[PDB]
Symmetry: C2
Subunit: 214 residues, 2 copies
């Protein structure tokens, strides 16, 4: 699916500045690298990408921003109107993104009150194409003593979203790092809650929580 | 394609007994008579269909596609401000990229509806079709009564027209000629105005006596 590639390339560049090899595309889009190379070759001919490493052109940016907007407004609509949880929305909107007309997103956007962020805090690009990215970094990238408000949680693993909800790490929850033990991949944080509990996040969980220091 | 096929065979035999030929699928869906048979063969190679006529496992798959389409048509009008003449072509597209979990929550949010915005019966999850006992208005005689049950959606021009005069599901109609020479029938609507409908218009209005 050609549209999946532009959205994936853009989401990879959203919180990192590395490279998106054709092998990175294949394993996350979900198809063999044999066809991903044959795929990514096509979009470069259409003037959408360029590639070694792959990048977005200007026609690919406005096209990927469109795909991201539909995906993320659909996730939001499934939670706020249809009763999904935040771990059930990504697989649904991953399929619904290629069958929706601009008219439907307009009424979805209008009924949702024009939301700017996901159930995961993922920024929803505007129709004009601005993108409201919050100024955040991963919890694992922080150091001892730092505080912050959870602003965005990755949805690559629905189990991890389930784990976060069970202990009390939601969007807008305030954390402080107590003991970051780089060896061996453990970080202790204090959730600012009513009874004020304390949890021990492993290295992968902390690399999924983006936080805003304020 | 291939779910659009099965859906069309069932919807064709829903209000008539005229049967389906490989070409008539090509004029409804949109393809050549050549490819039309090749798309039919793989539904027949699966045991979903054997003058098309579907089998038990084929009726079940078509009833699920019909249910998805009409639940979408209802969700669009009731939740997202669509008019009944805008939903078909859009719901014609969503029906292939929707999960059964999403349909169930749409179904539950709509209150478990039996009819869609056009009065078309919405099949149950197990294939329990709630067919209403209706006949074409053009088949009535002056002067029977009857509530409108189903209105055809093959043309959004007709639905847009019906809504303009005041014709919509549940409205009671009374026939007062009944003028074939004139190619139209006059009806009283109570809910008291007088409206004249041509033969093609009254042919897209199924009604339930008294
Ligand atoms: Mn997502
Ligand atoms: Mn997708
Ligand atoms: Mn998201
Ligand atoms: Mn329809
Ligand atoms: Mn269809
Ligand atoms: Mn309908």
């Amino acid at each position: 699916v050609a549209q999946d590639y532009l959205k994936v390339i853009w989401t990879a560049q959203e919180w990192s500045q590395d490279k998106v090899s054709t092998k990175m595309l294949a394993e996350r889009i979900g198809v063999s690298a044999s066809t991903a190379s044959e795929s990514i070759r096509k979009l470069a001919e259409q003037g959408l990408v360029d590639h070694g490493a792959v990048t977005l052109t200007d026609s690919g940016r406005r096209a990927a921003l469109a795909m991201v907007r539909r995906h993320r407004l659909l996730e939001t609509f499934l939670v706020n109107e249809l009763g999904y949880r935040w771990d059930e929305v990504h697989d649904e909107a991953e399929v619904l993104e290629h069958a929706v007309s601009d008219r439907l997103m307009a009424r979805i956007d209008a009924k949702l009150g024009f939301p700017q962020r996901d159930p995961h805090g993922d920024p929803i690009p505007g129709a004009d194409g601005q993108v409201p990215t919050p100024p955040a970094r991963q919890l694992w990238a922080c150091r001892d003593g730092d505080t912050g408000t959870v602003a965005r949680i990755s949805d690559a693993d629905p189990q991890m979203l389930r784990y976060f909800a069970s202990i009390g790490i939601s969007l807008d929850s305030r954390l402080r790092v107590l003991a970051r033990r780089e060896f061996a991949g453990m970080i202790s944080v204090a959730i600012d809650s009513a009874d004020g509990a304390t949890v021990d996040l492993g290295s992968p969980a902390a690399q999924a929580i983006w936080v805003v220091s304020l």
